[model samples]
Target: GPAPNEEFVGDMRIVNVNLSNIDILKKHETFKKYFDFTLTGPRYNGNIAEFAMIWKIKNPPLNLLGVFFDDGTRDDEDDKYILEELKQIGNGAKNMYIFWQYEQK
Candidate 1:
């Protein structure tokens, strides 16, 4: 909707760092400098939709990177079907973390 990283949090992982929505970090203080708007794509999907991946960042950058929905395979094949089509809409990011913060001078 508002573009993945518009204003969110969590431990974010980019399949292809070069093509991630890192720009969203611009508004953030710590992540801002680390962001370098690039373009990349088409990930893999294992038991889950897209990719069977997991995040391992301790102090995540945000609370919940963005809206996420795993492959709806367990529920019904149709769910998986829809997920398959959704996967086509690549060039996205996931597994982000929202960090705790205090007022800064």
Candidate 2:
């Protein structure tokens, strides 16, 4: 993630992505809603950690989903951009739970 004062204008590694919402999760449905718990931090170890409960939209096969950070900002500059990225990372993944862990570095 970018420093708090910097304008985030590039790709940042997604340290972790975990599904945390099910009531609204729609499987195999284009144009569906979803949610998750996301963890992010600065490049430095022990930096302030940012956790978010994200809400998203799944447009199916091609498009992945929309991740809205609790801070009111979309995961990327545009929702479409985030969906495109998710397609590359989350393609074909479903049902199984995902866990991401990173030690302070």
Candidate 3:
């Protein structure tokens, strides 16, 4: 079974996708909305590449919640759009601790 240590935190679940593959996420339509929101992060355990993101939906028809990537790179123009989106649904929340890892095909 896949265990990602999802912790419930204030209307959101902080998921850890360190053990999962990115392709699976990409296949999901809702996740596609988050493609631009994904940001590269430090390698997990010093090797596995990871991405940090956030989603507000608790069930089907997932809804985007918030996105935060302080140390990662992003397009300045896109950054403006992403920030606005986050503010609209962030519910005053600021950062996301959840992480997803990239898998080599």
Candidate 4:
């Protein structure tokens, strides 16, 4: 949406696109909302690790994995968001750190 009222004279005003509002993560709650952990806990490691920490999603509405990349598209919290995303992807998953069992023995 364009600003309610603003005036700036520019020749290229004829050909300019303003992309805004891709903030669904805020609108629809968060990564937590997408994944429902009704049944989740330690299972067999299957020799994958000392033990396996496992969980499933609801109807699979949620997928797996999250990571972080820093770029300049919109800048409010790329500095902060970058860290947060790394946690989701880790035990610490805002950055994808399921390398070993975490948060519990």
Taken over the whole model, the C-alpha lDDT of each candidate is 0.30, 0.28, 0.35, 0.23
lDDT of 4 by residue, 37-99 (tens): 332421111112211222321222122222211111122222233322322322211112212
Candidate 4 CA-lDDT value = 0.23
TM-scores across all candidates?
Answer: 0.19, 0.20, 0.30, 0.16
**How are the candidates ranked when ordered by TM-score, highest leading?**
3, 2, 1, 4
On a 0 to 100 scale, what is the lDDT of residue 100 in model 4?
19
The root-mean-square deviation over C-alpha atoms between each candidate and the true structure, in angstroms, is 14.7, 14.8, 13.7, 18.3
Judged by TM-score relative to the true structure, which candidate is superior, 2 or 3? 3
Candidate with top lDDT is 3
- Candidate 4 segments exceeding 4 Å error: 1-28, 42-94, 97-105
Clashes by residue pair, model 3 = none
Residue range with the least summed lDDT across 10 consecutive positions in model 3: 40-49
Model 1, range 7-39, lDDT digits (tens) per residue? Answer: 322222322122134345567663443323242
Better of 1 and 3 by TM-score: 3
Instruction: Give the total clashing residue pairs for model 1.
Output: 20
In model 2, which regions exceed 4 Å deviation?
A: 1-15, 24-66, 72-79, 82-105
How well does candidate 4 score on lDDT at residue 3? 50
lDDT of 2 by residue, 25-104 (tens): 34524212223223221111111123222323333232122232212222322223323344233222221122223234
- The lDDT ranking, best first, is 3, 1, 2, 4
lDDT of 2 at 50: 39
